[PDB]
């Protein structure tokens, strides 16, 4: 057998790990399958994509086109359907009809061998007609055969009878394919909408208490949910909800020792009250949780729980399973670190003594929360646990419950971030918060919307409890507004951590990315009613952004994204498309000064001519413009952070 077939079809993409891991999509998402296709000699080739579903049923006829002249790289767009495991194949073939037309168009006018050329075409059309299942299509090809063979007519009109638009259309639907050759199938894992598209809100239930009871419960925190759903969020991400340890518990502003009332860090999981399968007694009981999950469901909110595979020193695992920790010659366990940061309140897990036991327990815990309506997990620091451990765990859970989504909080080097996505993590945290200039965003989003999108789905949190970027510290409210627009229009999944709306931006000290009086070490009651009444919240903007996203399919997908040039470093512009929905975004990245620029739109990139003008509506104002080729803009920080425009049809 030969590695290469009769008509070469090579280097099919997308491909992940040489075909050992699947490329990804979600229900409804379009993407390009591509291949290198060519043949020996000068004759024409064709190709097409055969997409098969989990039952093996092929998709509709999906022909490909050479993507740039002279490159022999062919592609076409496919669209994923029901969830599950699909496969794709590329088929390549000789296209003898195209070759024959090309030659005949030259040979009949020049008077060369005309009878032979027409008879050769007649034999092709006859072969084409034989494989056409429809009788009206068959009869149309046979009539062109008869006109081609009619020696009483002039050569040009015998030929013209074979090139009519009604013949073209039969052959584009049922083409004559020689030497059909096929690639080996490649796997595609299709998952639910929410893995690619959603808006997320993180908050600490314990902060939503009452005057008489400061430490919130699941019942009091349920009262925050209607405001969250009113902002247009779909997912609620809760930090760890388990009992919190006492030994080496941390105090306010990350001080080493807790005083009597200090609540500690939710990430220091475990006490004699319970471990990862327990509720912190001050949040209530498992019943109170179910109530919270039910109320979230009634508002269109799914719950995502933090899953942090680590322990406080009071966690039951420390004495029940000491082999799950690395012990020093004197028997002590070194606390975790992420230098120069120290986590004195926790122990890291070790995996090389009882990997089976740790995997079995890990999936038990996850299945417990899944039994209580949790179908999404934000996994903390997955990169400090073995990559293969996550590969095994995710495959175990998705094997019985494929709807479960895992999100990797891996802020680390690129190889590890990518590898985690490839081995199963449905979503990934990104470098978004450290991409703030026009050049940084453009470069980074070109990476994420390009080849990486076949294995990684980005979740753009504009802030987190550990990341308050200098851009926000220095920019105030206008900076918060900018980053919300950026995050919500560039990624189909974005998120904020509560307080973002109030433009909380006091850092722990100059040069740091921690918040002052961080919610991780203390209760942080916020007076939401006052903020709303006094207009010192950007919740309305946030609400608007999620409404825009819900109304424009272009913003519920990742791969289609183009950047358009502007004549000012502080102003960025880009567009996104999906069917006939096109969205155009212009942002002023300067939060202090008013910026004017000329935005020059790559018009072919919107399906338009250079001369053309098109009506747009800025969905942040309801105000309408007519834009083309070159458009002036003026963006005043605080009044208008940006235009977010739909193209009107």
Ligand X SMILES: O=P(O)(O)O[C@H]1O[C@H](CO)[C@@H](O[C@H]2O[C@H](CO)[C@@H](O)[C@H](O)[C@H]2O)[C@H](O)[C@H]1O
Check the chain for breaks (C–N over 2.5 Å) and list the residue before each, or none: none
Interface characters, 374-413, with ligand X (x: CB under 6 A): ------xx---------------------------x-x--
* Residue at shortest CB range from ligand X: 267
CB atoms within 10 A of CB 363: 17
Task: Report the nearest approach of ligand X to the CB of residue 267 (Å).
Answer: 3
Task: Report the nearest approach of a copy of itself to the CB of residue 38 (Å).
Answer: 6
Strand 376-380 vs strand 310-311: parallel, antiparallel, or unpaired?
unpaired
Please say whether the beta carbons of 551 and 494 come within 8 A. Answer: no
391 binds, among a copy of itself, ligand X, none (CB under 5 to 8 A by kind): a copy of itself
Task: Report the nearest approach of a copy of itself to the CB of residue 605 (Å).
Answer: 27
Q: Is 19 in the site for a copy of itself (CB under 8 A)?
A: yes
Q: At what angle do helices 165-173 and 135-148 cross, to 10 degrees?
A: 130
Q: Is 36 in the site for a copy of itself (CB under 8 A)?
A: yes
Q: Is 611 in the site for a copy of itself (CB under 8 A)?
A: no
Q: Is 431 in the site for ligand X (CB under 6 A)?
A: no
Q: Could you give the CA distance from residue 317 to residue 365 in angstroms, rounded to a whole number?
A: 13
Q: Could you give the CA distance from residue 456 to residue 431 in angstroms, rounded to a whole number?
A: 13
Question: What is the separation of C-alpha 154 from the centre of its chain, rounded to a whole number of angstroms?
Answer: 59
**Size of site (CB under 6 A) for ligand X:** 18
Task: Report the nearest approach of a copy of itself to the CB of residue 447 (Å).
Answer: 15
Q: Is 338 in the site for ligand X (CB under 6 A)?
A: yes
Q: Per-residue DSSP letters for 168-223?
A: HHHHHHS---EEEEEPPPEEEEEE-GGGTSEEEEE--GGGS--SS--S--HHHHGG
φ/ψ of residue 160, rounded to 5: -55, -30
Task: Report the nearest approach of a copy of itself to the CB of residue 232 (Å).
Answer: 37
**DSSP state letter for 240:** P
Q: How far is CA 410 from CA 108, 339, 352, 417, 458, in A?
A: 66, 15, 21, 6, 12
Interface characters, 301-320, with ligand X (x: CB under 6 A): -------x-x----------
Applying CB under 6 A, among 79, 87, 246, 254 the residue interacting with ligand X is 254
Applying CB under 8 A, among 387, 502, 508, 608 the residue interacting with a copy of itself is 387
Applying CB under 6 A, among 392, 520, 544, 549 the residue interacting with ligand X is 520
Phi-psi region of 627 (alpha: psi -120 to 50; beta: other; left: phi over 0): beta
Task: Give the interface segment with ligand X, choosing from 23-31, 262-270, 313-321, 488-496 (CB under 6 A).
Answer: 262-270
Q: Which residues of 17-148 form beta strands (DSSP E)? A: 23-26, 30-37, 45-52, 65-66, 73-79, 84-94
Q: Is 200 in the site for ligand X (CB under 6 A)?
A: no
**DSSP state letter for 22:** -
Applying CB under 8 A, among 10, 44, 363, 603 the residue interacting with a copy of itself is 10
Task: Report the nearest approach of ligand X to the CB of residue 469 (Å).
Answer: 14
Q: Which residue number, 210 or 247, has a Cβ lying nearer to ligand X?
A: 247
Q: Per-residue DSSP letters for 307-353?
A: E--EE-TTSTHHHH-GGGS---TTS--PPEEETTEEETT-EE---SS
Applying CB under 8 A, among 156, 163, 179, 230 the residue interacting with a copy of itself is 179
Restricted to residues 10-39, the positions that interact with ligand X (CB under 6 A) are none
Task: Give the interface segment with ligand X, choosing from 260-268, 274-282, 419-427, 492-500 (CB under 6 A).
Answer: 260-268
Task: Specify the DSSP element, H or E, that contains 422.
Answer: helix 414-422
Applying CB under 8 A, among 119, 151, 168, 609 the residue interacting with a copy of itself is 119
Q: Per-residue DSSP letters for 548-588?
A: HHHH-GGGG-SS--EEE-BSSTTEEEEEEEETTEEEEEEEE
Restricted to residues 463-492, the positions that interact with ligand X (CB under 6 A) are 465-466
123 binds, among ligand X, a copy of itself, none (CB under 5 to 8 A by kind): a copy of itself
CB atoms within 10 A of CB 198: 23
**Size of site (CB under 8 A) for a copy of itself:** 48
Q: Could you give the CA distance from residue 304 to residue 405 in angstroms, rounded to a whole number?
A: 9
520 binds, among a copy of itself, ligand X, none (CB under 5 to 8 A by kind): ligand X
Q: Is 346 in the site for ligand X (CB under 6 A)?
A: yes
Restricted to residues 319-378, the positions that interact with a copy of itself (CB under 8 A) are 328-330, 337-339, 348, 352
The residues binding ligand X (CB under 6 A) are 250, 254, 265, 267-268, 308, 310, 338, 343, 345-346, 380-381, 409, 411, 465-466, 520
């Amino acid at each position: 057998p030969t590695v290469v077939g009769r008509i070469p079809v090579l280097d099919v993409r997308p491909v992940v790990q040489r075909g050992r891991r699947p490329a990804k999509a979600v229900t409804g998402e379009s993407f390009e399958v591509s291949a290198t296709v060519f043949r020996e000699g000068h004759d024409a080739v064709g190709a097409n994509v055969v997409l098969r579903d989990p039952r093996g049923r092929p998709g509709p006829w999906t022909p490909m086109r050479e993507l740039a002249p002279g490159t022999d790289r062919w592609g076409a767009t496919v669209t994923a359907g029901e969830t599950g495991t699909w496969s794709y194949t590329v088929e390549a073939w000789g296209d003898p009809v195209t070759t024959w037309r090309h030659h005949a168009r030259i040979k009949i006018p020049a008077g060369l061998d005309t009878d032979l050329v027409l008879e050769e075409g007649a034999r092709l059309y006859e072969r084409a007609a034989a494989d056409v299942p429809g009788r009206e299509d068959r009869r149309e090809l046979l009539a062109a055969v008869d006109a081609l063979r009619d020696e009483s007519r002039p050569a040009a009109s015998r030929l013209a009878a074979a090139l009519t638009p009604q013949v073209d259309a039969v052959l584009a639907r049922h083409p004559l394919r020689d030497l059909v050759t096929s690639s080996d199938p490649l796997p595609l894992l299709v998952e639910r909408e929410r893995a690619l598209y959603g808006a997320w809100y993180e908050f600490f239930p314990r902060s939503e208490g009452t005057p008489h009871t400061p430490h919130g419960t699941f019942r009091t925190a349920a009262r925050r949910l209607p405001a969250i759903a009113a902002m247009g969020f779909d997912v609620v991400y809760l930090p760890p909800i388990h009992p919190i340890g006492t030994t080496h518990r941390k105090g306010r502003n990350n001080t080493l020792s807790a005083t009597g009332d200090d609540v500690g860090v939710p990430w220091a999981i475990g006490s004699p009250e319970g471990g990862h399968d327990s509720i912190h007694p001050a949040l209530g009981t498992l019943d109170d949780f179910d109530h919270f999950v039910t109320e979230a469901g009634k508002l269109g909110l799914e719950i995502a729980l933090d899953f942090a595979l680590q322990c406080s020193p009071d966690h039951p695992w420390v004495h029940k399973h000491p082999e799950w920790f690395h012990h020093r010659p004197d028997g002590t366990i070194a606390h975790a670190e992420n230098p120069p940061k120290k986590y004195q309140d926790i122990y890291p897990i070790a995996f090389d003594a009882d990997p089976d036991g740790l995997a079995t327990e890990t999936v038990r815990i996850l299945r417990h929360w899944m039994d209580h309506g949790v179908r999404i997990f934000r996994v903390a620091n997955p990169h400090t646990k073995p990559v293969a451990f996550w590969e095994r765990v995710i495959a175990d859970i998705n094997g019985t419950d494929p709807d479960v989504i895992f999100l990797a909080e891996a802020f680390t080097r690129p190889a590890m971030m990518a590898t985690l996505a490839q081995i199963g993590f449905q979503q990934s945290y990104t470098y978004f918060t450290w991409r703030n200039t026009k050049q940084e965003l453009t470069e980074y989003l070109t990476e994420l919307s390009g080849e990486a999108a076949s294995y990684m789905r980005p979740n753009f949190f504009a802030n987190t409890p550990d990341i308050l970027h200098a851009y926000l510290q220095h920019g105030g409210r206008p900076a918060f507004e900018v980053r919300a627009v950026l995050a919500a229009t560039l990624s189909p999944t974005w998120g904020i951590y509560s307080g973002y709306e109030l433009c909380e931006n006091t850092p722990l000290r100059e040069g740091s990315e921690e918040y002052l009086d961080s919610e991780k070490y203390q209760l942080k009651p916020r007076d939401w009613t006052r903020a709303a009444r006094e207009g010192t919240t950007i919740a309305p903007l946030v609400t608007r952004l999620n409404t825009i996203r819900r109304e424009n399919p272009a913003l519920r997908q990742l791969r289609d994204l183009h950047f358009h040039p502007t004549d000012k470093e502080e102003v960025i512009a880009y567009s996104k498309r999906q069917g006939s929905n096109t969205v155009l975004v212009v942002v002023n990245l300067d939060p202090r000064h008013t910026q004017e620029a000329t935005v020059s739109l790559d018009m072919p990139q919107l399906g338009l001519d250079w001369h053309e003008s098109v009506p747009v509506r800025d969905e942040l104002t309801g105000e309408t413009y007519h834009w083309g080729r070159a458009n002036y803009v003026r963006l005043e920080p605080g009044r208008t952070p940006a235009h977010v425009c739909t193209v009107l049809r």
